[PDB]
């Protein structure tokens, strides 16, 4: 507000308009920038799931360790959370509470994957190509930027065929073929 003086300071030791304990460090904004996600409520739509992983992790930690339910049941779950690809490794059972973060689930987003597979140059520019309609998964093109992509389905993202951005790529290698009308 004012860079209040030293005697103003001690009466206002606690007031701050920009940063609140309720606001929690602005972690939600801070990862919305790093992954460039469109609408604001998208974070806490993941962070309700990413919290719900840990609540199932916790009560499955409260069962006794030599229980053939419990031993079966999180390894049943780490099969799925690795196939979807939110977590890097399948070995640790305590990745399921420690490595399950929103920024883990927010980088199996489609524009991050187009930046991981070096399709677009940056991560904003990949959102620019999805929204304009140049990218596709198998048959159908995808148009929501915020498409989660399975690690299995991560094989199949390509540029949409006959596009003006898959035509320019093939001109760089001097390998167009207009019988494909690339």
């Amino acid at each position: 507000v004012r860079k209040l003086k030293h005697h103003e300071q001690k009466l206002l030791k606690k007031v701050d308009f920009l940063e609140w304990k309720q606001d929690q460090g602005h972690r939600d904004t801070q990862v919305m920038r790093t992954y460039h996600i469109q609408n604001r409520e998208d974070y806490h739509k993941y962070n309700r799931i990413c919290g719900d992983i840990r609540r199932l992790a916790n009560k499955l930690s409260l069962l006794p360790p030599t229980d053939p339910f419990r031993r079966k049941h999180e390894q049943l779950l780490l099969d799925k959370l690795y196939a979807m690809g939110v977590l890097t490794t399948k070995s640790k059972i305590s990745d399921l509470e420690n490595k399950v973060t929103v920024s883990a689930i927010c980088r199996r987003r489609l524009p991050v994957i187009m930046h991981r597979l070096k399709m677009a140059e940056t991560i904003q520019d990949a959102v620019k190509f999805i929204e304009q309609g140049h990218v596709r998964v198998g048959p159908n093109l995808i148009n929501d930027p915020a498409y989660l992509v399975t690690r299995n389905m991560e094989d199949y993202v390509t540029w949409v065929d006959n596009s003006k951005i898959k035509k320019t790529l093939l001109r760089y290698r001097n390998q167009i073929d207009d019988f494909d009308f690339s």
């Binding site: 597979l117 399709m119 677009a120 140059e121 993202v157 540029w159 898959k166 320019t168 790529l169």
Partner: protein, 98 residues
């Protein structure tokens, strides 16, 4: 420590057989170790460079694929003059430069 000055004397190195002087300069050990380092300083930057050939991912699109062009053999060409401004003189510039 406890060693004479004669025990640390010298051991000189001998030269090429003078009958075999055509194939000049016999290489000792310390002249081989300059040769096998900087072959392994070539493969280790070539096996890496061949490893990027296996993983090209041919859907990659960087936005500087308009200024670069490629020769018909397949490897790219870059201009001698380098700059964006030394391309080719216009007819009005030649009409002044002549």
């Amino acid at each position: 420590k406890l060693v004479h000055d004669v025990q640390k004397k010298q051991h000189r190195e001998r030269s090429q057989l003078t009958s075999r002087s055509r194939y000049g300069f016999l290489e000792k050990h310390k002249d081989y170790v300059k040769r096998a380092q900087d072959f392994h300083r070539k493969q280790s930057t070539l096996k890496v460079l061949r490893e990027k050939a296996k993983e090209r991912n041919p859907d990659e699109y960087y936005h500087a694929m308009h200024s670069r062009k490629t020769d018909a053999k397949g490897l790219l060409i870059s201009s001698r003059h380098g700059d964006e401004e030394d391309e080719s003189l216009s007819m009005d510039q030649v009409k002044l430069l002549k």
